[PDB]
């Protein structure tokens, strides 16, 4: 209960606020984290706890305090997390991010570990699943000392490995990684993506069981960004099984949510406005995995097996062994 500046272990104060004030810990520590000394180890722990929770407004202000600090380790943590947030907010390109990180450099085992994990999030975001798979082999947990950060990174990696297993069509392994992230984490973001991934593995097996997993993930979808993603997953699930879709996004310019609205229009029969959506997406820079879905939706409209051919190539280029079964199945029906 000492003043904010001379705190010794956040890992003790955090374990008493989530058990006492669990429903309001975001606003409580949004004021407490900013009063910590940016030169101490506690302030460096706060940027990781704020970012794992994706309290983006809080994270961006802790980073400013770390960058403007004058302890070399805090400056290193602040700059690495700064590049991480830039990749999240699409204000720097991945090709320019790998060049930045080269000229400094990094010497703490935590930020040397997180530098590679950060890239795995970007690889996931732009559908470069070959680089994500291979990068995870360079994450060695034996280089990290035991403590608060290591357990937090273990949670991050459990969910990265769940998506690697999903992309490789290892559904049981993906569910095991997602279940271990749930059993050993209390962060809403971790639990949300765990149940989002569980549901993704059941999209083609059973509609209800996939929806049961997304329903659990709704309980952790307080972040409106997470809400938009769960809506897109439920929109994609409703379009696959041809069920009532109450999650169609009409007010968004995101490539993936625009595709899902076009997917919805295809199932409705509004070919004119499904084509118009796919028409404008042709002027957008879609990643290799988005282009796999894009040409699959094009094939459902034009019946051209060459559209399914190019969908498959794009799915193999991004190394997606799971959703590639959508164009493959649609031509097995054609003969």
């Amino acid at each position: 209960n000492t003043p904010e500046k001379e705190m010794e272990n956040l890992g003790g104060l955090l374990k008493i606020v989530k058990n006492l004030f669990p429903d309001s810990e975001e606003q409580l520590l949004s004021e407490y984290f900013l009063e910590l000394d940016p030169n101490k180890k506690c302030a460096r722990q706060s940027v990781e706890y704020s970012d794992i929770n994706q309290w983006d407004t809080l994270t961006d202000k802790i980073i400013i305090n770390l960058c403007n600090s004058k302890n070399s380790t805090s400056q290193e943590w602040g700059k690495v997390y700064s590049l991480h947030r830039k990749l999240n907010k699409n204000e720097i390109s991945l090709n320019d991010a790998i060049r930045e990180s080269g000229k400094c450099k990094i010497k703490s085992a935590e930020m040397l570990f997180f530098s590679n994990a950060m890239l795995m999030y970007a690889y996931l975001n732009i559908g470069e699943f070959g680089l994500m798979k291979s990068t995870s082999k360079l994450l060695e947990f034996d280089d990290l000392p035991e403590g608060f950060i290591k357990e937090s990174f273990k949670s991050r990696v459990s969910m990265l490995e769940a998506n690697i297993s999903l992309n490789e069509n290892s559904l049981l392994e993906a569910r095991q990684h997602s279940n271990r992230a749930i059993e050993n984490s209390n962060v809403n973001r971790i639990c949300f993506f765990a149940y989002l991934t569980i549901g993704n593995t059941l999209i083609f097996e059973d509609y209800d069981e996939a929806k049961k997993a997304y329903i659990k993930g709704q309980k952790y979808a307080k972040n409106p960004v997470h809400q938009e993603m769960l809506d897109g997953a439920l929109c994609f699930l409703s379009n696959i099984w041809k069920k009532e879709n109450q999650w169609v996004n009409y007010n968004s310019d995101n490539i993936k949510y625009l595709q899902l609205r076009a997917f919805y229009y295809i199932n409705q029969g509004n070919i004119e406005e499904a084509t118009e959506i796919l028409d404008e997406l042709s002027s957008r820079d879609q990643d290799e995995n988005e282009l796999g879905f894009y040409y699959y939706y094009k094939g459902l409209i034009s019946q051209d097996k060459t559209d399914y051919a190019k969908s498959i190539r794009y799915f193999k280029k991004s190394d997606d062994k799971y959703f590639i079964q959508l164009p493959l199945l649609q031509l097995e029906r054609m003969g």
């Binding site: 996931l124 990265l160 769940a162 993704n200 999209i203 897109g232 994609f236």
Partner: peptide
């Protein structure tokens, strides 16, 4: 497109 996340 399906929605993935970690």
């Amino acid at each position: 497109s399906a929605i993935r996340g970690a």
